Scaffold this active site. Structure first.
Site, short mmCIF file in Angstrom:
data_model
loop_
_atom_site.label_atom_id
_atom_site.label_comp_id
_atom_site.label_asym_id
_atom_site.label_seq_id
_atom_site.Cartn_x
_atom_site.Cartn_y
_atom_site.Cartn_z
N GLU C 71 0.84 -1.18 0.00
CA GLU C 71 0.00 0.00 0.00
C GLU C 71 0.88 1.24 0.00
OE1 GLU C 71 -1.10 3.16 2.52
OE2 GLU C 71 -1.22 1.30 3.67
N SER C 140 5.92 -5.43 11.77
CA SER C 140 5.01 -5.68 12.88
C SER C 140 4.58 -7.14 12.89
CB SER C 140 3.79 -4.76 12.81
OG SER C 140 2.85 -5.20 11.84
N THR C 145 0.34 -7.28 6.27
CA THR C 145 1.61 -7.29 5.56
C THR C 145 2.76 -7.61 6.51
OG1 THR C 145 0.63 -5.60 4.16
CG2 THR C 145 3.00 -6.00 3.93
N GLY C 146 2.82 -6.92 7.63
CA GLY C 146 3.89 -7.18 8.57
C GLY C 146 4.00 -8.63 8.95
N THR C 179 -4.05 -1.57 15.86
CA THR C 179 -4.97 -1.12 14.83
C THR C 179 -5.96 -2.20 14.41
OG1 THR C 179 -3.48 -1.71 13.00
CG2 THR C 179 -3.21 0.48 13.98
N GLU C 183 -4.87 -9.08 15.73
CA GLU C 183 -3.41 -9.12 15.74
C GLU C 183 -2.85 -10.35 16.44
OE1 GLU C 183 -2.94 -4.28 15.72
OE2 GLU C 183 -1.28 -5.60 16.27
N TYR C 224 3.25 7.47 17.07
CA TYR C 224 4.24 6.61 16.42
C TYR C 224 5.58 7.33 16.32
CZ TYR C 224 0.72 3.11 15.19
OH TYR C 224 -0.26 2.12 15.24
N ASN C 228 8.85 5.52 17.65
CA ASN C 228 9.83 5.05 16.68
C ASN C 228 11.20 5.68 16.90
OD1 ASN C 228 7.88 3.44 15.61
ND2 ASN C 228 7.45 4.73 13.83
N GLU C 254 27.78 -13.46 14.67
CA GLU C 254 28.20 -13.36 16.07
C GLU C 254 27.04 -13.03 17.01
OE1 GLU C 254 31.80 -11.02 16.81
OE2 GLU C 254 31.18 -10.81 18.92
N1 LIG Z 1 6.09 0.86 17.25
C1 LIG Z 1 5.36 1.05 16.15
N2 LIG Z 1 4.28 0.24 15.91
C2 LIG Z 1 3.54 0.41 14.78
C3 LIG Z 1 3.86 1.41 13.88
N3 LIG Z 1 2.95 1.36 12.90
C4 LIG Z 1 2.07 0.35 13.14
N4 LIG Z 1 2.43 -0.23 14.31
C5 LIG Z 1 1.78 -1.38 14.96
O1 LIG Z 1 1.64 -2.36 13.95
C6 LIG Z 1 0.43 -3.07 14.12
C7 LIG Z 1 -0.36 -3.00 12.82
O2 LIG Z 1 0.47 -3.39 11.75
P1 LIG Z 1 0.84 -2.39 10.54
O3 LIG Z 1 2.32 -2.26 10.29
O4 LIG Z 1 0.19 -1.06 10.83
O5 LIG Z 1 0.09 -3.03 9.26
P2 LIG Z 1 0.85 -3.37 7.86
O6 LIG Z 1 2.11 -4.15 8.12
O7 LIG Z 1 1.13 -2.12 7.04
O8 LIG Z 1 -0.13 -4.46 7.18
P3 LIG Z 1 -1.63 -4.12 6.64
O9 LIG Z 1 -1.98 -2.65 6.89
O10 LIG Z 1 -2.58 -5.02 7.43
O11 LIG Z 1 -1.65 -4.44 5.15
C8 LIG Z 1 -0.26 -2.45 15.33
O12 LIG Z 1 0.12 -3.22 16.45
C9 LIG Z 1 0.37 -1.09 15.43
O13 LIG Z 1 0.40 -0.59 16.74
C10 LIG Z 1 4.95 2.23 14.12
O14 LIG Z 1 5.25 3.12 13.34
N5 LIG Z 1 5.70 2.05 15.26
C1 LIG Z 2 -13.12 -3.42 17.03
O1 LIG Z 2 -11.88 -3.25 16.35
C2 LIG Z 2 -11.90 -2.44 15.24
C3 LIG Z 2 -13.06 -1.77 14.90
C4 LIG Z 2 -13.09 -0.95 13.79
C5 LIG Z 2 -11.95 -0.81 12.99
C6 LIG Z 2 -10.78 -1.48 13.33
C7 LIG Z 2 -10.76 -2.30 14.46
C8 LIG Z 2 -9.53 -1.33 12.50
C9 LIG Z 2 -9.61 -0.26 11.43
C10 LIG Z 2 -10.96 -0.28 10.79
N1 LIG Z 2 -11.94 0.02 11.84
C11 LIG Z 2 -12.73 1.20 11.74
N2 LIG Z 2 -13.14 1.59 10.54
C12 LIG Z 2 -13.85 2.70 10.47
CL1 LIG Z 2 -14.38 3.14 8.87
N3 LIG Z 2 -14.21 3.51 11.45
C13 LIG Z 2 -13.78 3.12 12.67
C14 LIG Z 2 -13.95 3.71 13.90
C15 LIG Z 2 -13.34 2.94 14.80
O2 LIG Z 2 -12.75 1.84 14.19
C16 LIG Z 2 -13.04 1.97 12.86
MG LIG Z 3 -0.81 -1.13 6.18
#
Ligand SMILES: Nc1nc2c(ncn2[C@@H]2O[C@H](COP(=O)(O)OP(=O)(O)OP(=O)(O)O)[C@@H](O)[C@H]2O)c(=O)[nH]1
Ligand SMILES: COc1ccc2c(c1)CCCN2c1nc(Cl)nc2ccoc12
Ligand SMILES: [Mg+2]
Ligand SMILES: Nc1ncnc2c1ncn2[C@@H]1O[C@H](COP(=O)(O)OP(=O)(O)CP(=O)(O)O)[C@@H](O)[C@H]1O
Ligand SMILES: Nc1nc2c(ncn2[C@@H]2O[C@H](COP(=O)(O)OP(=O)(O)O)[C@@H](O)[C@H]2O)c(=O)[nH]1
Ligand SMILES: [Ca+2]
Ligand SMILES: [Mg+2]
Ligand SMILES: [Mg+2]
EC number: 3.6.5.-
Lengths: 54, 332, 437, 428
Positions: C71, C140, C145-146, C179, C183, C224, C228, C254
């Site tokens: 993405e 992640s 993806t992570g 997010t 997870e 973040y 980071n 090592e």
């Molecule tokens: N420490 C830290 N955690 C992050 C960061 N960005 C995302 N996360 C954590 O990563 C998890 C979500 O994975 P992401 O990296 O956001 O998702 P992605 O790898 O881009 O994969 P998709 O969006 O599902 O296609 C959650 O636990 C977030 O808190 C960051 O910049 N720093």
């Molecule tokens: C219960 O765990 C949730 C619940 C919802 C969502 C997610 C996790 C991950 C991202 C997508 N997502 C959401 N998507 C939209 Cl459009 N609005 C909202 C508002 C709050 O979360 C929203």
């Molecule tokens: Mg992503």
């Protein structure tokens, strides 16, 4: 107690301090997993198109 | 409203603590596997400490100290006392003990001492005077057992020539304050003491259940501290505090200060307290010996009300406030 | 010298890569346009920083890095940001639709269409290496993806580069910053599939980094960006041995030797100190003993757990700043007499120490204060298994009802891969318990 | 970019649909001309999700207006923002559906549906990466119900790998045009259960009660109900239209909200509750936003959440406020009421925050709950259905269009099953 393997240089130094002594899958099989899963998806899609045709 | 869960239903003490908590109006009880608790009255085996303190927005507390088993398991207590410089080797208050395995060599070092010098040589697991005789017990059970010097010259009460052990309840809070309940109990032996043959059970060992004379000299075979203090005054010209309790407070302080570095939750992400049961033996010269430490102890029927209320005041309400003291603070 | 290639996967991996490479440049004196005045060898060299940077004929120092995400939003920020000129555009690989927090969509459905492109871009950096050491993979656990795409990438790197080491920096999921509700599923699936393909992995629990920022940086709700820049500091001190002159952990091989005696138990705990706020008007600068002591307080760990109730298999101290061995040994002598540090019986009770005299760097206008001396401790403790227990329990709670499982089967996975992954986790937890009691 | 294609069908579909484009166009700073005269660039960063960019850098909603009778659509074109829509995206018949699911789904709607799909196809082919579709419609009429579901079935056939999301208005005897609405709603719910990923159950019963009891309106209009619908529709799409820590799309929303495919019917909620015209001068404190947003009196589906359990919850806070306080208040709600959130989905409440508030409010909170208490709404519909179906009453309207009693029996069975499945997870 014992300090050993002390190595120094201009950037810093390093050493080890002891206190007490002691007492793979292939490309072929990876392709045969990615394709197995795409098969399973294309089947699920086909069952859906067949259902919608009904 | 604070929130707690109950993961050990056998707990007489914490059965009474959840009752008191619910009857405050400020404590809700959740399902035992609901993670969003403030307080956990946890199981005794395999309590999942690793899952405590990771709920954001919740201060979490638990009625057990991780690592406290090192004191409350007969085998490790003996290990802890022999290896810790804070106690080892010979502290005046622990009976010479050895750890044995049924799959031993140092035991025979002092046993061959104690027969050729005619010294008293009765030991315990259970009891007898010849070393090899009790290995039948050790070996047909299959567990690690401890062989300890039997206190042949104890202090007997009159009338009755009875035997006793002292149980003291100690509460250690999240700050590592050491609270010793002012009410101890004397688990008493009803049938007279006889040092002839050590297989007569009832009269040498003083477990409350192992006496079911039950109620002859006082109800339930329990002698509160007031009556025992009076007896020491009239009979021996001394008090419970001077002859016995100073040594008990010293042993409790020494044991718990020893492990404080390994178990304290001061900087941890979850908090611990724990109620303990120290069991002492007093000998012929008013000398206190530590027998065992108990990790999940029960309270005498009389003192349940008062002690459980103080668990709330001191260990639970100190962390989750609401809206004379029955504990003696052992200072450090 | 031997080159290392860094691979940043998904949002967490990319954003943390930005953080690290920004910091690397400030430490090596490399400017945003890629120029490095300190470098007198124009166009090449076998210097220590050349492990992480190649050189163009025009004097540009370019990271041996590739950024991959399914993405474009996040990597688009790299393409236009302060270090726009730093990266060859072929190192920034993006897709069009992400894995929607679904490991199976990242691994199977979408991953299968970009995996060959990524390996060709990875192959183009490897062909610029005289003696490639291996890879550092940032990602992640929780992202689709992570988790999903890293897993498949890790399997392929094993076949194409079987004689090269692979280290991970893995972000472990925490609800205060997560997010997605699935997870735990993704974490277990990707740990299972990657476990045999990683030689050493440093887990960072977002919950540990969050509280550190709240507690020691007085940041009420860390971004973040806050997390980071702190993470990049820890990563920098782990990689410094690869980028500077030294005798300790000079090559990726090592790290496994010093930190991982058993292949599966390859998750060392990182502890870092001191973390001092830049906005603090008065700071009393902490000593070697004080900062070495901090290394044994759980509140400074990258994962919250209690090492007093586990056993150590290895322990390295990496100091930066004004530190001399005399003061380290003095501090170690005190700590062992006042703390519960117990090693497995089959390992020596010792610390491997490395010291870099350059004090830690901080990004201008950051949240971290400049300190006279700092340390990162890497210990491999059975105590880390608490995090596997936490993760596994959450997994068990949803998988008992098959919640959300349909989203994965619908991308081509079989329900059985959930249980296989979970059984491997079960095996991993049992291994840690055997070693640790 | 990740574009959504919007489809409004029938009288209700087009009336709430028009107000939606009215409300979000104002939020993003687009006028009825189609020009952007806003102040902040945070309104344009994801304008593409719902808008195309035509000549003269004008923004045109990616919307298709569908109806079997031309009257309401002409009203939309006549309306305030009517000229913002693309004229070729108006697809109308002339017969009308007569509040009859059969005419919309099987006879009159069949003629028109291919023309709609021609317009849908044209909008899809222009998209960089289409996420899916949004349908606005009622379940109790004929076009939005019968044709809307027929469209959803055909959209899924041609785009089986895209998300289908609906705003479905459920009928209620308190706001009722016809006795046959329980027939139409039951037939439609059977289609929604199979062919959508996310359905917002907008209950006209709830909207009437809110207007009567809370908002102190005695004889509410569809305009008063639609005021609440536009506010809700704005809230639940905030994380699609504005950038945030979440960067959300229709698929991530289904992935995280739907633990089991058939249980994808959400209760929306909104706070503070606002009646048209009169503006409230005191902003709510974050503790109040939180208490109101979980209050049954703020739910847009007439169900009692204490009669079920929350599978998943999504919440959107809009305004300039402390997200430290927002995070503490939301944790406060789950910790003090954990009984109503399933043990077996950890951390099932997710909260987002957006700096830009809706027109008129200085702070607002929108609530998306997947609760097992939604059964109460389907049980209500089933009760009304069976009362007539047991006597085959009013069925000739439908057998006259070729339908069989078997089809009614099937639709009723599936929705009963949907009820049983919600009840199975309420006790787990
Ligand atoms: N420490 C830290 N955690 C992050 C960061 N960005 C995302 N996360 C954590 O990563 C998890 C979500 O994975 P992401 O990296 O956001 O998702 P992605 O790898 O881009 O994969 P998709 O969006 O599902 O296609 C959650 O636990 C977030 O808190 C960051 O910049 N720093
Ligand atoms: C219960 O765990 C949730 C619940 C919802 C969502 C997610 C996790 C991950 C991202 C997508 N997502 C959401 N998507 C939209 Cl459009 N609005 C909202 C508002 C709050 O979360 C929203
Ligand atoms: Mg992503
Ligand atoms: N060295 C010793 N010398 C004399 N008596 C001893 C002794 N060790 C144990 N006893 C006796 O046995 C009892 C104590 O044994 P022990 O403490 O191991 O019991 P227990 O652990 O099964 C029950 P609790 O945990 O409630 O105390 C007392 O009656 C005590 O007199
Ligand atoms: N909330 C709301 N409900 C409506 C509106 N218009 C119609 N309804 C409801 O929709 C049903 C009638 O369906 P309608 O949309 O007019 O039928 P259609 O045009 O054939 O699709 C009844 O339940 C009405 O109460 C509206 O503008 N708002
Ligand atoms: Ca050079
Ligand atoms: Mg005992
Ligand atoms: Mg009508």
């Amino acid at each position: 107690m014992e300090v050993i393997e002390l190595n120094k240089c201009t950037s810093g130094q390093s050493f080890e301090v002891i206190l007490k002594p002691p007492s793979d899958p292939s490309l072929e099989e990876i392709q045969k997993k990615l394709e197995a899963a795409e098969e399973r998806r294309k089947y699920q899609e086909a069952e859906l198109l067949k259902h919608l045709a009904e | 409203m604070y929130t707690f869960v109950v993961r050990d239903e056998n707990s007489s003490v914490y059965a009474e603590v959840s009752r008191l908590l619910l009857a405050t109006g400020q404590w809700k009880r959740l399902r035992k596997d609901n993670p969003r608790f403030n307080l956990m009255l946890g199981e005794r085996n395999r309590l999942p400490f690793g899952r405590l303190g990771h709920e954001p927005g919740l201060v979490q507390l638990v009625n057990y100290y991780r690592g406290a088993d090192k004191l409350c398991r007969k085998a490790s207590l003996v290990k802890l006392i022999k290896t810790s410089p804070e106690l080892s080797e010979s502290c005046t208050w622990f009976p010479e003990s050895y750890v044995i395995y049924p799959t031993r060599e140092v035991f025979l070092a002092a046993y061959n001492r104690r027969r050729e010098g005619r010294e008293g040589n009765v030991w315990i697991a259970l009891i007898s005077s010849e070393a090899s005789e009790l290995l039948d017990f050790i070996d047909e059970q299959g567990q690690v057992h401890v062989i300890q010097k039997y206190l042949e010259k104890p202090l007997l009460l009159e009338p009755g020539h009875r035997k006793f052990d002292i149980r003291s309840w100690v509460l250690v809070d999240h700050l590592y304050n050491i609270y010793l309940y002012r009410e101890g109990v004397l688990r008493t032996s009803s049938e007279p003491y006889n040092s002839a043959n050590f297989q007569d059970k009832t009269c040498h060992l003083t477990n409350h259940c192992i006496q079911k004379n039950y109620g002859r000299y006082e109800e339930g075979n329990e002698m509160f501290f007031e009556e025992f203090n009076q007896y020491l005054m009239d009979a021996l010209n001394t008090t419970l505090e001077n002859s016995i309790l100073l040594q008990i407070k010293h042993i409790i302080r020494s044991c718990l200060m020893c492990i404080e570095p390994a178990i304290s939750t001061k900087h941890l992400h979850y908090q611990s307290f724990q109620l303990f049961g120290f069991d002492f033996m007093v000998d012929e010269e008013l000398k206190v010996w530590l027998i065992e430490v108990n990790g999940a102890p029960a309270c005498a029927q009389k003192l349940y009300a008062e002690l459980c209320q103080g668990i709330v005041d001191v260990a639970i309400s100190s962390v989750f406030p609401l809206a004379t003291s029955i504990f003696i603070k052992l200072h450090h | 010298m031997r080159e290392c290639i860094s691979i940043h996967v998904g949002q967490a991996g990319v954003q943390i890569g930005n953080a690290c490479w920004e910091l690397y440049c400030l430490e090596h004196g490399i400017q945003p346009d890629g120029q490095m005045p300190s470098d007198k060898t124009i166009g090449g060299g076998d210097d220590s920083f050349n492990t992480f940077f190649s050189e163009t004929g025009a004097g540009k120092h370019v990271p041996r890095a590739v950024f991959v995400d399914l993405e474009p939003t996040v990597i688009d920020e790299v393409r236009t940001g302060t270090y726009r000129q730093l990266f060859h555009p072929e190192q920034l690989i993006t897709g069009k639709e992400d894995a929607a927090n679904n490991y199976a969509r990242g691994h199977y459905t979408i991953g299968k269409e970009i995996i060959d492109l990524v390996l060709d871009r990875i192959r183009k950096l490897a062909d610029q290496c005289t003696g490639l050491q291996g890879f550092l993979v940032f990602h992640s656990f929780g992202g689709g993806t992570g988790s999903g795409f890293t897993s498949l990438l890790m399997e392929r790197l094993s076949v194409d580069y079987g004689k090269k080491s692979k280290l991970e920096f893995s972000i472990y999921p925490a609800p205060q910053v997560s997010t997605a509700v699935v997870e735990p599923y993704n974490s277990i699936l990707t740990t299972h599939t990657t476990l045999e393909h990683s030689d050493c992995a440093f887990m960072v629990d977002n919950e540990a980094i969050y509280d550190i920022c709240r507690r020691n940086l007085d940041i009420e709700r860390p971004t973040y960006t806050n997390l980071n820049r702190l993470i990049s500091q820890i990563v920098s001190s782990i990689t410094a041995s690869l980028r500077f002159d030294g005798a300790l952990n000079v090559d990726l091989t090592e790290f496994q030797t010093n930190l991982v005696p058993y292949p599966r138990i390859h998750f060392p705990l990182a502890t870092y100190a001191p973390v001092i706020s830049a906005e603090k008007a008065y700071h009393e600068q902490l000593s070697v003993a004080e900062i070495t002591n901090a290394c044994f307080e759980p509140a400074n760990q990258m994962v919250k757990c209690d090492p007093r109730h586990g056993k150590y298999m290895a322990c390295c101290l990496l100091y930066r700043g004004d530190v001399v061995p005399k003061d380290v040994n003095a501090a170690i002598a005190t700590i062992k007499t006042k703390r519960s540090i117990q090693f497995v019986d089959w390992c020596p009770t010792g610390f491997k120490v490395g010291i870099n005299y350059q004090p830690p760097t901080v990004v201008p206008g950051g949240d971290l204060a400049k300190v006279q001396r700092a340390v990162c401790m890497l210990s491999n403790t059975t105590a880390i298994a608490e995090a596997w227990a936490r993760l596994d329990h959450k997994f068990d709670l949803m998988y008992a009802k098959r919640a959300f499982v349909h989203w994965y089967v619908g991308e081509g996975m079989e329900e059985g891969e959930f249980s296989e992954a979970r059984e491997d986790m079960a095996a991993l937890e049992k291994d840690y318990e055997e070693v640790g009691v | 970019m990740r574009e959504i294609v919007h489809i409004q069908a029938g009288q209700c579909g087009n009336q709430i649909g028009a107000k939606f484009w009215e409300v979000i166009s104002d939020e993003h700073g687009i006028d009825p001309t189609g020009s952007y005269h806003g102040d902040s660039d945070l309104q344009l960063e994801r304008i593409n999700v719902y808008y195309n960019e035509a000549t003269g850098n004008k923004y045109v909603p990616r919307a298709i207006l569908v109806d079997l009778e031309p009257g309401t659509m002409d009203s939309v074109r006549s309306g305030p923002f009517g000229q913002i829509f693309r004229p070729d995206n108006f697809v109308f018949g002339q017969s009308g559906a007569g509040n009859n699911w059969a005419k919309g789904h099987y006879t009159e709607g069949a003629e028109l549906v291919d023309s709609v799909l021609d317009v849908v196809r044209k909008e899809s082919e222009s998209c960089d990466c289409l996420q899916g579709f949004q349908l606005t419609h009622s379940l109790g009429g004929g076009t939005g119900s019968g044709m809307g579901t027929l469209l959803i079935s055909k959209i899924r056939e041609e785009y089986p790998d895209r998300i289908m999301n609906t705003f479905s208005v459920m009928p209620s005897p308190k706001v009722s045009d016809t006795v046959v609405e329980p027939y139409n709603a039951t037939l439609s719910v059977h289609q929604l259960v199979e062919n959508t990923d996310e359905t917002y159950c907008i209950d006209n019963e709830a909207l009437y009660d809110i207007c009567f009891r809370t908002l102190k309106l005695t004889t509410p209009t569809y305009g008063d109900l639609n005021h609440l619908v536009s506010a809700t529709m704005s809230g639940v799409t905030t994380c699609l239209r504005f950038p945030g820590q979440l960067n959300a799309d229709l698929r991530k929303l289904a992935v995280n909200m739907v633990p089991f495919p058939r249980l994808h019917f959400f209760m929306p909620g909104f706070a503070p509750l606002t009646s048209r015209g009169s503006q409230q001068y005191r902003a709510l404190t974050v503790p109040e936003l939180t208490q109101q947003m979980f209050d049954s009196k703020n739910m847009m589906a007439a169900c009692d959440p204490r009669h079920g359990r929350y599978l998943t919850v999504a919440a959107i806070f809009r305004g300039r406020m402390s997200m430290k306080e927002v995070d503490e208040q939301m944790l406060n709600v789950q910790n003090k009421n954990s009984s109503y959130f399933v043990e077996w989905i950890p951390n099932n409440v997710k909260t987002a925050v957006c700096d830009i508030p809706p027109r008129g409010l200085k702070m607002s909170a929108t609530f998306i709950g997947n609760s097992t208490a939604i059964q109460e709404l389907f049980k209500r519909i089933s009760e009304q259905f069976t009362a007539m179906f047991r006597r085959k009453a009013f069925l000739h309207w439908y057998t006259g269009e070729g339908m069989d009693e078997m089809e009614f029996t099937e639709a009723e069975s599936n929705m009963n099953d949907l009820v049983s499945e919600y009840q199975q997870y309420q006790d787990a």
